[PDB]
Design a binder for this molecule. Structure first.
Ligand SMILES: O=C(O)Cc1cccnc1C(=O)O
Lengths: 286, 280
């Protein structure tokens, strides 16, 4: 047959992306619990500035989602090669013209550039119309990241709901959170604010909060709580204002879809997913 | 017609709540839908009668919305052969069995998604998050399912007293994961959730291990807010309730898209506030 083309995206703690060593290999490291980190070679663009050519190079990937990939490949006995999504985005469907196209990892899966998405990819109605999602490998939701000492109560705070240019907030472009705010007309006031300020990646937005250039970042709680556990100048506020899960993504014709989902269920039930939590997600605390 | 579906459910508050029909006018009013329950005449006959009842609750509101958006009508009935679903000598009972054996097109209620059930039915996307949680009296020092008080109970004098309600997804998981704990626990089996809450409140039990969504709801309604779930509401083996359909069902695709639309449009949070929020 053929090896599965896996597409993923940079998103700590789920996918870390690091340079290879000079000899093209990945440096040996150990987890916080002393076990060797499993690393895979993942090719992807080094340059990520919008509107520029994309120069692809081998890189090193590891983390929660890479461990999960390796488990799935062992369980179901497939081989794979991993690459990073070329445009750096999760995936939304946008109007061009009356045509609509998917970008991001969604676009790569639908075009055949990937056969499976293994990433913190949110399950939503828009994507589920086009692709098959596994049962969720992670249950989480949305929350709000701010600089420690910034006082907002959460999604209903007046500085969010009656916004101005004095208090700037945003999410990641072409992401499930962008879709969420665009879909709900009751959020249209917030969507019009965020649209002026959305970031190309989660990492850049998080750094912007640290740098007092972005006052609140609205994003996945599985990511934001991890950052707040590691960086004591950052905190989340308001707890989950909307719940969602991450799933493995495949085309609707995929022969793997049934057994991927059963494997996810089995891993929740036998403690494997909790092991991944203890290794990658929940181990610091400020 | 192919648009009129047999659907099975199970009473479990607040997901499914069963009421008597008004003898007159013998019609379900307000936010309730008709649901029927087969009731035996006696234990020396197979004869029974389908008693007309009325059903409401979180899962009933989901069903009403699915009926409208996916465009089907239904004949809702209450399972009488077991409860949620257990495989006994390789034969499924409960809601799962009704679907497996094609007595129901789907099962709608507090039905937990797990691997062994997914082998015999298809599940919709989860519409309510659940898992395995632990209810205790506030202040009880228990880390979680892996606590040594649960794993190696006889290392403590006196030993910790804890149990579950048997024959559902929770007991299945403990039996498979923690053999010594499981064989210890069965002397504390509880016949149902209401019995277990009384055993906890009166000191006959130290902990009750069970479905997270149910335990969170009971904790929210507890008189005095004395019973809590451990870990600020921690959950082992996170999963969800899902609609169970026959394998290969032509309804799954639109059911899934509809459920995901309800979630994405805020409609699910409204039902949560309507049915699942508690004082505590
Ligand atoms: O958790 C159990 O053991 C039983 C149970 C309780 C509440 C909701 N669902 C279930 C189920 O087995 O589907």
């Amino acid at each position: 047959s053929t090896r599965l083309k896996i597409v993923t995206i940079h998103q700590e703690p789920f996918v870390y992306v690091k340079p290879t060593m000079s000899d093209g290999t990945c440096k040996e490291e150990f987890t916080v619990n002393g076990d060797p980190v499993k690393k895979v070679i993942c090719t992807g663009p080094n340059d990520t500035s919008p509107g520029s050519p994309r120069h692809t190079v081998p890189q090193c990937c590891y983390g929660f989602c890479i461990d999960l990939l390796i488990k799935l490949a062992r369980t179901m006995n497939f081989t794979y090669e991993v690459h990073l999504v070329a445009d750096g985005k999760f995936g939304t469907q946008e109007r061009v013209s009356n045509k609509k196209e998917w970008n991001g990892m969604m676009g790569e899966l639908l075009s055949g550039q990937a056969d499976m998405i293994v990433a913190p990819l949110t399950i939503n109605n828009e994507r589920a119309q086009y692709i098959e999602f596994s049962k969720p490998f992670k249950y989480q939701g949305l929350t709000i990241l701010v600089k420690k000492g910034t006082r907002i109560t959460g999604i209903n705070d007046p500085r969010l709901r009656n916004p101005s240019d004095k208090f700037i907030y945003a999410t990641v472009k072409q992401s499930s959170v962008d879709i969420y705010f665009r879909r709900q007309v009751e959020l249209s006031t917030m969507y019009r604010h965020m649209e002026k300020h959305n970031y190309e990646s989660a990492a850049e937005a998080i750094q912007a909060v640290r740098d007092n250039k972005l006052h609140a970042f609205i994003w996945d709680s599985a990511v934001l709580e991890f950052e707040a556990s590691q960086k004591c100048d950052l905190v989340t506020t308001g707890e989950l204002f909307f719940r969602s899960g991450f799933g493995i993504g495949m085309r609707k014709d995929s022969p793997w879809k049934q057994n991927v989902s059963l494997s996810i269920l089995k891993s929740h039930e036998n403690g494997f997913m909790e092991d991944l939590d203890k290794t990658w997600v929940r181990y610091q605390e400020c | 017609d192919d648009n009129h579906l047999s659907i099975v459910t199970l009473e479990e508050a607040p997901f499914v709540i069963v009421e008597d029909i008004d003898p007159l006018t013998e019609t379900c009013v307000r936010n309730t839908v008709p649901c029927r329950k087969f009731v035996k005449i006696n234990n020396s006959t197979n004869e029974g009668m389908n008693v007309k009842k009325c059903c409401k609750g979180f899962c009933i509101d989901i069903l009403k919305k699915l009926s409208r958006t996916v465009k089907f009508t239904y004949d809702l009935y209450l399972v009488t052969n077991g409860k949620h679903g257990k495989k006994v000598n390789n034969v499924w009972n409960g809601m799962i069995g009704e679907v497996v054996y094609q007595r129901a097109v789907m099962a709608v209620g507090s039905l937990t998604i797990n691997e062994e059930r997914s082998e015999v039915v298809d599940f919709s996307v989860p519409f309510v998050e659940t898992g395995i949680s632990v209810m205790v009296s506030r202040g009880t020092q228990v880390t979680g399912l892996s606590d040594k008080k649960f794993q190696r109970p006889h290392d403590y004098s006196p030993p910790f007293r804890f149990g579950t309600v048997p024959n559902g997804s929770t007991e299945r998981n403990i039996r498979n994961n923690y053999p010594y704990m499981h064989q210890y626990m069965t002397r504390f089996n509880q016949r149902g959730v209401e019995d277990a809450l009384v055993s906890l409140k009166t000191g006959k039990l130290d902990a009750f291990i069970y479905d997270a969504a149910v335990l969170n709801y009971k904790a929210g309604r507890d008189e005095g807010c004395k019973l809590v779930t451990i870990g600020s509401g921690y959950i082992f083996a996170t999963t969800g309730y899902g609609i169970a359909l026959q394998k290969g069902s032509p309804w799954k695709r639109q059911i899934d898209l509809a459920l995901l639309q309800f979630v994405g449009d805020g409609e699910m949070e409204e039902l949560e506030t309507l049915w699942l929020t508690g004082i505590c």
